[model samples]
Target: MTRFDVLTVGNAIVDIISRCNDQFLIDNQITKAAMNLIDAERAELLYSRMGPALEASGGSAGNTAAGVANLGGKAAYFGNVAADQLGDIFTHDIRAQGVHYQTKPKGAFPPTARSMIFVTEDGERSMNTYLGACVELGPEDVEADVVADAKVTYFEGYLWDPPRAKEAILDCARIAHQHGREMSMTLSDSFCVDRYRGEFLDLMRSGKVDIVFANRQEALSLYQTDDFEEALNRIAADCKIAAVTMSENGAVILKGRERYYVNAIRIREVVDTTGAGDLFASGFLYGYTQGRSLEDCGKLGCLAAGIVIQQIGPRPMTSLSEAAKQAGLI
Candidate 1:
């Protein structure tokens, strides 16, 4: 078993993004800026009607794993997919980026997981997802040795929708702890937090999770508090480290008695906000693996996020040496 800096477990998805007008949402009865789960038929129908799309492999945790690899860190990923076209694409893309792809593809399922993204003129993307093969990820997919070899095991809260995936997450956490490894989790979205608030609160209070990642809205929803400061205070007491991202306002890193607020890297043009949080985690984790200070970690996170948002999709960096130098990370 090879040792790794981080091992991520979560959904594996193929992102199909297109530029669309407001009429598309009205035609499909889809709300703006929200992730709605659709069936394969709906996904197909939407695809047929939408404009030209760019395909890229994406998932919440998968993006973070890819980000880690981009920063010259050793990373591995485990997630389910169907033995189909999209599945092959996902595997290839992640492997090409140098992330370990160990989970087996499902022989049978709806299809590989896919998100149909509609980007509006204002640069906000509304997503419709068909979980498809991602739901096939279960406890059986968890590898004991893999968990044991990683310094940290990371998961995204989106897995909570599939009960078996949740079980796999818990299994990974347990194995990581047993092996003296740290466990980290991301509160994927505000909607996800709303759906699994009770379970998430329990996990935080149980002391099983060592690191926590959340955006401003997610943290607020998770703690059931209206104020961001209140939520930050609550998380400091519950988890060892909490990273809270606040869009343009920047991010905050809280570790016990220490707290640092990182300013967002200014971008001339914001192309897409697709994987900002994922790239932020990537920068922070990469700095962490390199033993950088917490403030520097957050700053690197801001730089990583800035780069990704400038592009159309989440493109893995060949190496962060240039970016780090530009951001004064070196």
Candidate 2:
């Protein structure tokens, strides 16, 4: 009797997406389409230079959790926000999307986390994140009952930043396994892999992470090789399952010696790539919980990723449940 389909734990952030011209990236020395970590001071320094932006609740795991709910899956999220106004907004937004988020807000931490996302004419977004209160998410935040109640416990690599989260994630994984639940994790970014390649490899091989996800670059970095077969074979052997996304080329799902390949759905245009991978996880995980075929699971992931990249934010404006079912994906 699983109370939730997926339980995702990580940073809780509010995204402030503003439109900036090409010159903004150059003047700020910001790399386009990359997530850059900045402190509270730098977040302000960059915010002062930005145009008016729209606000939304977004964090890697948060976005994926929201997508699961959007696709009509029973989803729960565990992330930290402060007792401030921004935290209130983040709580409101995710709850509004029908995902459960019940982390307590404390006054001792910094303000709620925020990311200044500058979307350019070319659809590339340069993101600067201020961790703030998010880093305060500690071991006590991982509710044991919640971990036991979910079918799958999902975490992101970015959660590895704060030293405090180390014990929390492992505990959650242990608790999930104690209850016969599956465990999953996304590499999040190439830099994250660089920061913890040895630890990540050891964790995956230990069978703690049942399903591991990465993009082409992260997979390449994890294996310390640029060759395709090496990356594919290594990740497959490292975890019980490995799913790698190849930007326009589609995805490869490897479990032991067997592999499942999925093609990307064609999109009219790509407005922003912010939530592409997160949404892809949402669809695939949702389909998996539904006992859908492996082929359908990858196709659903591609379909959800396709719908999100056509929008400006990391979220889907359209109801993904209807979109997937109407496409006969369910």
Candidate 3:
């Protein structure tokens, strides 16, 4: 198996991003700026009614995996997808982005996973996801070779919804530690944190997870506190490293008692906030696997997050390494 800098695992999904009005959101009953699970019937109905869309491969961790590769890092991915058109798109796109993805595709019975992201005029995206074949990810899919070969084995908290994905992640984590590799994960979203707060804390406190990434809202949700400083201290005590991102206020990095903060990069406009967090994880992980300082990692993360938010989609249109070079960051 090919060794990797970062190996990430999560649902494999095709994102269909479309621009829509507030009225459309009202009519569709979609909660703004949140990801909601939908059935296949709702998925089809929403797709049929939405305006023209730009299709791309996207999932919480999948985006991070792709982001790591885009930054010129050796990245690998594991996620479930069916042998369908969307699955083909997801696989091809991730590989094209330079992420090693060799997870077996299921036969074309259950359709590939998809998320219809409706971006309102205000730049907020409301996601409706149909987790099709992604739900099939189980412990059996955890490849010991890949996990052992990676410097860090990362995953998304969203995987907890798949029922068996938690088992798979546990198996992957075991293999990673057995090879003396680190394990990390992103909290994904505040909604996800609300669902698995206890288990997430368990994963960190018990030393199953060495590093963690979370946005301000998710950080607050994870510790069940309204104060941001309280949440930061709480997470710092629980995990070895915690990177907490605050939209325009910047990001805070904590490794044991060592604390560092990086200000958010100023940008022209926020086009879409779709993959900001995922790309942040990407840059941070890339810096981490390269042995950069915590402050430098946070700066790289801010650079990536700044770049993605000024674009129309979750994935960056420009080369991240080139951007980093221009900024004298690498």
Candidate 4:
């Protein structure tokens, strides 16, 4: 019954990332920079063929939950996993990060969902996911009381693929509002926006969502426009807070009619761009729960994102609080 700063709900997935070349992508027929869902068989085949990869707990929402916990914020996560070794690993890792995760695991379900991510030399990663137990997520698995206890209930747009999970998102949103909690959402990818454009806009227009996180590509996809300002104007009117991230160009924050900008933190070398958006949302939401200013929140997000891209994985490997203290974000 403990309160949480953020409660993130979405697919539970383990990420297996490896490095490869453009030719490898061509030979494997993996479209670069896109997420492709594969079956368990295909996932195993890809794993067998892929180079050395590191396994970690990862899902769009899960990573954000971990990031919140990393920054010393209260975090709780909801996602389904099978009763297997991988599920154990995911649970252990998330709790180890200080997130409160007690979602029940299913025994008869398919194996745990896993994303086979291939990071190229240029720092771009292409993902192939096997949504095994992740697909089993439904409204029945959602905890309304947990949603009610959070300051913000955050969700990922990628859950649209599983029809039940989509309904679960709606349920979680309703529960959050019923308890006077705010709801936040991330436009996971541009492709996801393209697929559920109307529904996403409706969620904003109906006032069901209070905050939104999107990258430039996702922003364009949301408005179906080439003009960034046009999309910004559209989102400003739709949600209470719209945070759009532009890689390297930095991040833009729009709350009400006011706009703020944050410069992306510089890194020694760009190692991987895996969880930039997720961690950005993490920092921004954490700042939000603390009632920090828009500029500070945006800068905290940029600082968090910078830490992840400089490493080989999506989640931060170091103490984000320490980094935030160094950068005066605390």
Task: Give the candidate number with the greatest lDDT.
Answer: 3
The sequence of per-residue lDDT tens digits that candidate 3 reaches over residues 261-298 is 99999878778889999999999999999999999999
Cα lDDT, all candidates: 0.86, 0.88, 0.92, 0.90
| lDDT-best of 2 and 3 | 3
Provide the lowest-lDDT 10-residue window in model 1. Answer: 312-321
RMSD of each: 1.7, 1.3, 1.4, 1.4
| Candidate 2 off by > 4 Å | none
Q: Candidate 2: deviation at residue 168, Å?
A: 1.0
Q: Write the per-residue lDDT of candidate 4 for residues 1-330, one digit (tens) a residue.
A: 448999998889999999998999999898888778788789878888998779988998999999999998999999999999899999899999999898898774698888999999999889999989988899888788889899999999888876689888889988899888999999898888888999999999998899999999999999999999999999999999999999898999998899999999877888889999999998999999988999889998999998999988778989999999988888
Model 1, 236-256: lDDT tens digits are 988899999998999999998
Superposed model 4: Cα runs more than 4 Å off: none
How many backbone collisions does model 1 have?
0
Instruction: Write down the worst ten-residue block by lDDT for model 3.
Output: 105-114
lDDT of 3 at 146: 88
Q: What TM-score does each of the candidates earn?
A: 0.95, 0.97, 0.97, 0.97
Residue-wise C-alpha lDDT for candidate 2, range 173-249, written one tens digit per residue: 89999899999999988878889999899889898899998999889888889898999999999999787898778
Model 1 per-residue lDDT at 54: 91
